[PDB]
Amino acid sequence: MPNFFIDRPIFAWVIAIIIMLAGGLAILKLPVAQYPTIAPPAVTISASY
Amino acid sequence: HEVVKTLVEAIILVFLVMYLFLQNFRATLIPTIAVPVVLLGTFAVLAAFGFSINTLTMFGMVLAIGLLVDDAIVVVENVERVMAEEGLPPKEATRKSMGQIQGALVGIAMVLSAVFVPMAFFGGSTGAIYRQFSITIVSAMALSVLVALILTPALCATMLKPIAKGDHGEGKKGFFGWFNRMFEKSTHHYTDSVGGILRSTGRYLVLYLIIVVGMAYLFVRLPSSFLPDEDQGVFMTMVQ
Amino acid sequence: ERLSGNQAPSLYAISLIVVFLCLAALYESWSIPFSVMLVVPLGVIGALLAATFRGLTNDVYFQVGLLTTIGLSAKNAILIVEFAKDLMDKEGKGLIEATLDAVRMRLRPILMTSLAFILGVMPLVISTGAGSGAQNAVGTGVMGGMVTATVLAIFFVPVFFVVVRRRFSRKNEDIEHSH
Ligand SMILES: CCCCCCCCCCCCO[C@@H]1O[C@H](CO)[C@@H](O[C@H]2O[C@H](CO)[C@@H](O)[C@H](O)[C@H]2O)[C@H](O)[C@H]1O
Ligand SMILES: CCCCCCCCCCCCO[C@@H]1O[C@H](CO)[C@@H](O[C@H]2O[C@H](CO)[C@@H](O)[C@H](O)[C@H]2O)[C@H](O)[C@H]1O
Ligand SMILES: CCCCCCCCCCCCO[C@@H]1O[C@H](CO)[C@@H](O[C@H]2O[C@H](CO)[C@@H](O)[C@H](O)[C@H]2O)[C@H](O)[C@H]1O
């Protein structure tokens, strides 16, 4: 496998460019927030008398 | 169902063209078996990935037939080419044939998914319509590659009538004789001319550039739309 | 809209990028993919020629069957140069020879897939009645694209190759290799 790519440097490069392009597109789509949702969920019943 | 019927037909029309070039029932029965194997495979995938049988998936199958039959044709044709260049038994030929095109086949399945997969990434309303084709077609051609180096070579190994060195079929009497004798001769003129046009280079670059021009033109003038308005055999009248 | 429309131009950009990249890896070159990428317009010219002729629109159905034509065109291109390249590497043949020998080996299978597919979608372009609109759109585009892809390419691919080999040769060409 490394010997594979020691002979195929372009193929080596290519895989890199794809992974990068992929990440590039990821950076655009991805949400941005402070923390992930890490509080637990809650439900509240409200009544009035 | 009307689309379904077209699959069935296109398969039948394919099997006729095959008979023409391939000259023998068992040979042309090979790409004929491949196509529905894959198509049926794709219905399996769709179901897994949770899609449904809809107008776009159906056309997806339809369009898939081109990609499918080409994988099959490419494989069968190669073996047959080998058998005539180097006079070899079936099992031998396919065995060396598959060695010679296996790489290209898996390579191409990737290059192609590059042209179909991005479709799966349109956003909103527009997206889901295009996504259907994208998965279908991509799925269908994965199965196609898989099938082309699992089943096609097996069939190609067993079912192919052995062809002798130089037997290009020019010799057999009847219509198949003419077609083969014509194709052989036609082939030569094809390289005789390509031999010729290659000598120039220049004249054809502009020719190409013209095409690029025209394409750009015809494209910018041609209108756009989403989906056609089908005759549903029903309609409304409103009264105010 | 609303909420952003027109995203395709951007996707066909990464698409046209990833396609070169893969082909670059396939041929172990940056220069050879071009002699495959250049066949793209040879089928679009016919898809367009047809949809206008027959008075169609650039609709979802026209687009998808366009790609299908782009794919098959590309595939046949890919296999021709793959065959030409592997004839100046495994054997030791010249540019013109490697090209010629490849392109005749590849002619039968291409006519084979073209006729079978064009003929195969004929039911669509001829279709009337229910779902017709769809069937006609899909079928007309592909039909035209496949005709012009076939006829144009097989006289254009041989050129693309020998031209890009020559703009990117490194003085080790051209005569005849050995061994
Ligand atoms: C062979 C090569 C590739 C081409 C094959 C593609 C086939 C396309 C089929 C889509 C047609 C739509 O209709 C589809 O047909 C099947 C089978 O009759 C129906 O199946 C129905 O009939 C049977 C009766 O025995 C019931 O058991 C079943 O519960 C019921 O759903 C489906 O309700 C429907 O989804
Ligand atoms: C998202 C992460 C990144 C993943 C992306 C993967 C990249 C895929 C792009 C195209 C793949 C090309 O496909 C592959 O190309 C090489 C090119 O040397 C071919 O390799 C073939 O030719 C060479 C020599 O010319 C042989 O030594 C080799 O053993 C043979 O298989 C393979 O037959 C083919 O399978
Ligand atoms: C080598 C890789 C292969 C890729 C090459 C690509 C060349 C052509 C292939 C497909 C044709 C492009 O198709 C393109 O799609 C978009 C989106 O639906 C269209 O866009 C149009 O319709 C849609 C939907 O109503 C809207 O998003 C948009 O506002 C409008 O301009 C373009 O007008 C059309 O030209």
Cβ B36 vs Cβ C90: under 8 Å: no
Q: For residue C8, how far is its CA from the centre of ligand 3 (angstroms)?
A: 5
Contacts of C17 in chain A (CB under 8 A): 21
Torsion over CA: C124, C127, C133, C137 (sign): positive
Spatial CA neighbour of B148 closest among B55, B51, B13, B37? B37
Residue of C nearest to A18 (CA): C18
Closest CA–CA distance from residue C82 to any residue of chain A (Å):
16
Please name which ligand lies nearest the alpha carbon of C11: 3
Stated in angstroms to one decimal place, the resolution of this structure is: 2.9
Cβ atoms < 10 Å from Cβ of B78: 21
The alpha-carbon radius of gyration of chain A (Å, integer) is: 24
* 3-state SS assignment for residue B122: coil
Q: C66 lies in which domain range?
A: 1-179
The whole-angstrom separation of Cα B79 and Cα B98 is: 8
Q: Which residue has the tokens 């046949």?
A: C76
Please name which ligand lies nearest the alpha carbon of C21: 2
The torsion angles phi and psi of B50, rounded to 5 degrees, stand at 75, 25
Index of the ligand 3 atom closest to the CA of residue B130? 18
Indicate which residue's Cα is closest to atom 32 of ligand 2.
B103
Q: Which residue has the tokens 């030791």?
A: C92
**How was this one solved?**
X-ray
Query: Residue A42 contacts by C-beta under 8 Å, 6 or more apart in sequence?
Result: none
Cβ atoms < 10 Å from Cβ of C122: 16
**Which neighbouring-strand residues pair with B224?**
C58
Residue of B nearest to C49 (CA): B218
Spatial CA neighbour of B56 closest among C11, C59, C32? C59
| Integer angstrom CA distances of residue C37 from C15, C20, C29 | 12, 7, 13
* 3-state SS assignment for residue C32: coil
Spatial CA neighbour of B65 closest among C15, A15, C124? C124
**How wide is the angle at C-alpha B153 spanned by C-alphas B151 and B159, nearest 5°?**
95
Q: Are B130 and C60 a contacting pair at CB < 8 A? A: yes
The total of structural domains in chain C comes to 1
Cβ B151 vs Cβ B94: under 8 Å: no
Domain holding B142: CATH number?
1.20.1640.10
* Strand residue runs (E) in chain A: none
Contacts of C29 in chain A (CB under 8 A): 10
Residue of A nearest to C11 (CA): A25
**How wide is the angle at C-alpha C98 spanned by C-alphas C76 and C25, nearest 5°?**
55
Domain holding C158: CATH number?
1.20.1640.10
The whole-angstrom separation of Cα C58 and Cα B178 is: 42
C19: nearest CB among B69, B114, B228? B114
Between helix B55-85 and helix C132-167 the angle, nearest 10°, is 40
Contacts of C119 in chain B (CB under 8 A): 13-14, 16-17
The whole-angstrom separation of Cα B70 and Cα B64 is: 10
Against chain C, the chains showing at least 3 CB pairs within 8 Å are: A, B
Cβ B160 vs Cβ B90: under 8 Å: yes
Index of the ligand 1 atom closest to the CA of residue B1? 11
Q: B45 lies in which domain range?
A: 1-177
Contacts of B124 in chain C (CB under 8 A): 3
Between helix B175-198 and helix C95-105 the angle, nearest 10°, is 150
